[PDB]
Design a protein around this ligand. Sequence first.
Ligand SMILES: O=C(O)c1c(Sc2ccccc2)c2cc(Cl)ccc2n1Cc1ccc(Cl)cc1
Length: 254
Amino acid sequence: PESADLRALAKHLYDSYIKSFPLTKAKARAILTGKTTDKSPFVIYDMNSLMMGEDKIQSKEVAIRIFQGCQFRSVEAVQEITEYAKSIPGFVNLDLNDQVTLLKYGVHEIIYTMLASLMNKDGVLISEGQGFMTREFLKSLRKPFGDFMEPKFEFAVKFNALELDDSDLAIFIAVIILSGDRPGLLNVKPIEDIQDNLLQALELQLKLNHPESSQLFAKLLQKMTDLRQIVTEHVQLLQVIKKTETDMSLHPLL
Ligand SMILES: O=C(O)c1c(Sc2ccccc2)c2cc(Cl)ccc2n1Cc1ccc(Cl)cc1
């Protein structure tokens, strides 16, 4: 009886989703189907394509500049995640430090999954679908730059297999956002109750959109906890960032 209404509420967030996320998974996999009216984006196999691809988008080296690109488009994505989380009923009624804490620990995970929406078996989409780069080239970068994005693939091959459509991610990223099992938290009640309702809606949205599917919900939550593993493992990265300041390089001619 109650669930009948929230579906609408669920779909409400769907609207804000595309209003907050300009590129949907359906359009990513679509532009990667080849059966699309739009032009096929260009691959990035070899440095030739890099030289001719920076056009279709202080820095000096580029093996760093790519990394700076990933994190830059990340700080662009968070600006979508802010307003999205705002559009969650009750979200602004929680404590400001509690909300910034919620996004504090979830951002890398949700950009992980969205990137998985732009990912595939071998490669990823760049610049709102206008580009495509390959993992094989990614393996060949100077260490540790070669190992930065591959785990992302190691998640995309597992996640995109469930082949969720945007109507599921629109609220799944909400349930990952409103997670109550984080340290340094203040108001316990609101995240518990709202995550309960969220889990109510998500349950039978999952069960409704795919009746042939067998227990995608549960194991997918298990993959949420796997995303928690990967935030446990981002501590290394945030320190490998230390390759970009005062490094005994003199530029007399450059
Ligand atoms: O300009 C971009 O949109 C982009 C960039 S930025 C860029 C990259 C190469 C030449 C010029 C800019 C980017 C960089 C990396 Cl190493 C990986 C993915 C990247 N992307 C695509 C991207 C799309 C979505 C998200 Cl969340 C993160 C990255």
